Amino acid sequence: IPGANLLRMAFGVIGTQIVRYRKFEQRVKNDQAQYVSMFGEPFDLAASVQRVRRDQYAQFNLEFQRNYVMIFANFDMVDLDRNMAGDQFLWTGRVFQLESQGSWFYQDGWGVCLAVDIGAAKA
Amino acid sequence: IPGANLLRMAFGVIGTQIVRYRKFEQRVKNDQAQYVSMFGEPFDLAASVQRVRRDQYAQFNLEFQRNYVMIFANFDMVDLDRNMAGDQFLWTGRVFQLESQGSWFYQDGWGVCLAVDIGAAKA
Amino acid sequence: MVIFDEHKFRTLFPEFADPAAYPDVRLQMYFDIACEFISDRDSPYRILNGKALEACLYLLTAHLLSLSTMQVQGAAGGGVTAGGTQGGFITSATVGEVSVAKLAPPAKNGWQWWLSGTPYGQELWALLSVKAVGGFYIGGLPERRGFRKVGGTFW
Amino acid sequence: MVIFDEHKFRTLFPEFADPAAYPDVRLQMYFDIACEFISDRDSPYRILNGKALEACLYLLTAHLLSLSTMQVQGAAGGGVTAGGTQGGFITSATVGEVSVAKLAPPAKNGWQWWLSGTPYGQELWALLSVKAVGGFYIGGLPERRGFRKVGGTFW
Amino acid sequence: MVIFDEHKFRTLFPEFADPAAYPDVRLQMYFDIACEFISDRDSPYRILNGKALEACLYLLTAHLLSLSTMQVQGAAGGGVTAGGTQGGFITSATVGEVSVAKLAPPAKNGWQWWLSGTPYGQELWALLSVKAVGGFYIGGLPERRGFRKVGGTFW
Amino acid sequence: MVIFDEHKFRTLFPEFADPAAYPDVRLQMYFDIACEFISDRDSPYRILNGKALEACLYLLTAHLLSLSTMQVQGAAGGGVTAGGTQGGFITSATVGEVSVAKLAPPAKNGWQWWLSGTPYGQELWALLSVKAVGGFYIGGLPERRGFRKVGGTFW
Amino acid sequence: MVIFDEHKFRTLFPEFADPAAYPDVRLQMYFDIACEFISDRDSPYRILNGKALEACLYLLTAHLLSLSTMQVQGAAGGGVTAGGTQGGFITSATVGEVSVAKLAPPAKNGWQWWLSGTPYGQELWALLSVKAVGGFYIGGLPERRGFRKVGGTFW
Amino acid sequence: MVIFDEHKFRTLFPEFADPAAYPDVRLQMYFDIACEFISDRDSPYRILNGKALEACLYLLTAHLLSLSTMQVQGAAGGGVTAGGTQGGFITSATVGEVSVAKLAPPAKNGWQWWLSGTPYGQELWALLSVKAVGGFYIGGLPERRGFRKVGGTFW
Amino acid sequence: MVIFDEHKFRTLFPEFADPAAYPDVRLQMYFDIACEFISDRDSPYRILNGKALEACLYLLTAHLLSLSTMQVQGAAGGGVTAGGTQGGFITSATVGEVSVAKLAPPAKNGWQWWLSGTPYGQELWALLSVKAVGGFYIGGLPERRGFRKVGGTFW
Amino acid sequence: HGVKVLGIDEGMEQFDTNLADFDSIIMNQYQLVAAIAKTPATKLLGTS
Amino acid sequence: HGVKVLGIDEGMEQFDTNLADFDSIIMNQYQLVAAIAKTPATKLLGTS
């Protein structure tokens, strides 16, 4: 049934991991016509992180591997619109590009590994 | 369950091989703007080695068959980042390009056959 | 009647530590409901006596609380599900490229099948199964005391 | 007859707390329907009595209300489906890349199969199963009080 | 003969509130048909008596009405199907990437299998199953009243 | 009662050696809970005696501790799951390109099925099975010591 | 009680040759635990005598040591697994494009199913099965010695 | 005890010819372990006698040595496997584009199931099965020698 | 004792014609082993005697030789396999896009299952099955010779 | 008053034989023998 | 009045033997012995 969620009962068997999730609120300029985003109140969420496992390529005598991650969560996660998306970090900052069945009961994810986290208990 | 290592118990049935594995530490220059890398303390690792089985091509009169290998191991090994890669040799040096589910319990590998090993008990 | 202690209950099950989401009145009401599935009267002659009885009562209360709190805030719409969320044991599951299959418990009636829903119910079922060994002998009188046996004894 | 407390009923199930969506007349009507399934006469000599019987009646009322919801607004298009929504335990389900399989309850007739549709029905079935242990012996006279046994006793 | 009340029927089943699509004459005709599957007379000595009888009659009438109204407007061509639409319990279903599997009810004859078609039939089957406990003793005379037992009594 | 040695307990199981994550009061509470499943009275005439009883009690304590760990940090989000993590033997599992299938243990009731969820429970079940061979004889008197047999002996 | 020899144990099982990873104290503790599953008392009239008993004790110790060392450091997080690793026979396995299917052992209770977990347990079970042939005769007296048979003999 | 000839043992199995990989002390140890499984006392009145007994002992020694090799260097990484390599008949296998399925042997207990692991064990089991035909009769006296039959003969 | 003739053996099985890979010493040793599975003693009263016994011994020797020579050079590394190569009947196979499925022979014990490994074993089993018809009558005396029947005869 | 212990896979079975018919055969044969010799059986066998 | 407690997989079985037939053959053989000695069995065995 597309009523009561299936991910909630699924997490009662397989077992999950813990990530920190922060959402996007608004955006401003930096007198260069470049947008800088604002995020607020990074809370704690339980989700399942999956495997897609990248290969690398070349632009010209450079390698530039793209780091990717798949995440399952029961939350309404937005990846792109006229506003900006949200962030997460299992160990380093990450940002995703997709949608899923949020308006019924659960969604699905992606993620590209941004460089690092700040530190001081992994802020 | 993404808990106990599945490749750990699977290796108790199928049977594996033994390879020598060395990790990357840091690199320097050679007054030519060419990076020269250095590794440290090769050790023995138990892994399962598979096939993907190369077919060759041509550029002009030059065949250039590229040799590939697929390896399963319970090691958190990295193929490429802003740092170097890792090395192995079943009989000749190799280098891989991929990742896998390292942060839970096991990973998967690759490999391209470099030329040869040094010798003297297969250094 | 056995006095319900909130502090001991919260100590036993740390997942119910949050007082805002789990008010005392709700816990007391669910304990009052649970004292009808299992008799709360205590005597030294009962099979379930001592603090084992309150252990079973606490397990049943936790099971009821979990099953009840499932419905209210599950489907991300305040339990807007037409028929609620049905309980039961999950034999198999799959999320993406992860799959788990478990062993079905030996359920024979509604009581055991319902108890298998949550880990507290499973623990209660296990405890009852351990304590259920043996049997009862209710009617009868000591007729053998009137005859002489072996070494001129009547015992 | 047993007086039906609307306030306590809404206190028991917070998901029905909205008075606008669930008028009191609807709850009273469903209680009056449910009092025919189970006799509401209370005596100290019944197996079901007191707050246990009250909880049974309230659970039956909740089951009926949820089943009514499945039809009134489970489709939500005014019940435009030709056959209407059907109830029952869902053995397996699949939505996208998530699949879950459950354990089939041991239903042997229409009563238990119909009860297993919703969690309230499952709880009512479990309570009835707990209270149903034992038996009855109706026709009988104290025949054994006319003979002297063991220690000159008649009991 | 129980007098059919249209207002109570529409109150009980809000999905039949529309008077344009469900004229009173059709409801009366279906009640007149349904009073033949189940005897419409009432006596205090019957197992089904009081409000239970009218509840059963209303459920049967709703079942017949649903089965009939499914036929005439289903296939978007005014029931142009050659053989009509067949009823029955739907064990499994699938629409795109949504799949549901249910539990088969224990039907053993035509009556129960037909009743399992729609939720009203399922509720009627459940009520009959509850009320069907026990049995009848039809022939016999009080033979035991002629002999003295226990304490010089003839009861 | 049997004295519970926390130091020797952590010595037995190095995975519980951290005093910060596993306070001694929690271990004492779990031992006090586990002493109700198995009687801790020690006599030379019991089948379970000596250090075997200590091993059984410690294994039960470890099993309870593992099941407790499975809940509050097994989900690790404060146990936000609606029903909580469920326990049981995992017959089959699959993670990506690796899949393994195991053998289902012969469980016949709630006790053995619950025990088979963790390695400590399995070890406890195996020890009980080893020690359980044989039987008891309860009622009986040496009636054979009154007659002369074979070589004029009464033994 | 039989004196445990670390040198002989390490010679028999070279996989435990590392003194740093496998300290003597752990081996002695596991031997002390294993002397409760199997009695360490030796008499010439038993079935398992001398070297056979030594072999069974060593195999049981190795089995316990392997099962214990499974949990502590295997899951790449220092045994951070919520419920540890569950043992048992692995019927099938798959790694990429390699698949193996084996024959399930004939386990019928907890003892044999637990023993089937590791090769040392399997060897111990095989040895016990070989030595288990025959039966016991416990009660009885030589009655036939009092009658003359065949060739005027009493044997 | 039968003298174990290492020279003829290596002659029988050329795969164990290398002395560096298989020292003589290891072979003597495994023979001493194997002589516990099967009694090595030789008499003309046993079922196994002559070179059959030494062939059985050599086959059992080869089986134990093969299993030891599988454990020590089947993984070859020092046995860093969690529980070690497990033995048994491989019913089915698949490596890439080639798959092979075999017939399951009729194993009925731990002894035969353990034996079927390696070809030497299979050969030993087959020889034992061949030699096992027939039976024993133990307690008996020639009572038929005291009567005259047919042609005045007592035989 | 039947004298082994290598010339006749090589004539019968041309696949063993190569004297370099199959020295006569190995053939003689395997014949000496095979004379123990089947008795080499011959008498005219035996069910198998003469050329049948010779063929049986030769087939058994060939079977043993094939099973032995499988190990030493199988895996292209001189039998570097830890557990060797296991035998048995192959009921199915697949190589690319070629698949074959065969009929499982009726094996009921270790002897027949082992014999089904190789064609020589299958032929030996077939010959034994043909020669195994009937039975033995071991005890008894000609009692009927003492009475007169039909035409005054005593035969 | 003794107990034998067997395995779960083991079994035990017993057989008997009914000897309640040899009497008539023996006595009929002896009666025929007496008939042949023209002597009453009470003298040859000493009892009818 | 004693009860033996056994496990679920346990089993106990009992066997009996019938010894009624011995008397007839014993008396027949004794009668034959008396017949050979040419003396009535009442003298040898005290009773018929």
Numbering used by the authors:
A (entry chain E), B (entry chain A): 2 to 124
C (entry chain G), D (entry chain H), E (entry chain I), F (entry chain c), G (entry chain Z), H (entry chain W), ...: 1 to 155
J (entry chain h), K (entry chain g): 337 to 384
Copy the relevant paper text.
Bacteriophage E217 infects Pseudomonas aeruginosa and is part of an experimental phage cocktail developed to eradicate P. aeruginosa infections in Galleria mellonella (wax moth) larvae and vertebrate models. E217 is a PB1-like Myoviridae of the Pbunavirus genus characterized by a ~66.2 kbp genome, significantly smaller than the classical enterobacteria phage T4 (~169 kbp). Here, we describe the structure of the whole E217 virion before and after DNA ejection at 3.1 Å and 4.5 Å resolution, respectively, determined using cryogenic electron microscopy (cryo-EM). We identify and build de novo structures for 19 unique E217 gene products, resolve the tail genome-ejection machine in both extended and contracted states, and decipher the complete architecture of the baseplate formed by 66 polypeptide chains.
We defined the atomic structures of all neck components, namely the head-to-tail, collar, and gateway factors, which connect the icosahedral head to the contractile tail. The first part of the E217 tail, or neck, was visualized in a localized reconstruction after applying C12 or C6 rotational averaging, which yielded maps at 3.3 and 3.4 Å resolution (FSC = 0.143), respectively. One unique penton of the E217 capsid is replaced by the dodecameric portal protein gp19, which is an attachment point for the ~1500 Å tail apparatus. However, unexpected for a Myoviridae, the E217 portal also contains a C-terminal α-helical barrel projecting into the head. Interestingly, the barrel is folded only in the pre-ejection conformation when DNA fills the capsid. E217 portal dodecamer is attached to twelve copies of the head-to-tail factor gp27, which closely resembles P22 gp437. Gp27 assembles to the portal by inserting its extended C-terminal tail at the interface generated by two portal subunits, suggesting the head-to-tail factor oligomerizes upon binding instead of existing as a pre-formed dodecameric ring. The other two neck factors, gp28 and gp29, reduce the C12 symmetry found in the portal and head-to-tail to sixfold, which is maintained in most of the tail apparatus. Six collar proteins pack under the head-to-tail dodecamer with gp28 N-helix positioned orthogonal to two gp27 subunits, explaining the C12:C6 symmetry mismatch. The last neck factor, gp29, connects the neck to the sheath lattice.
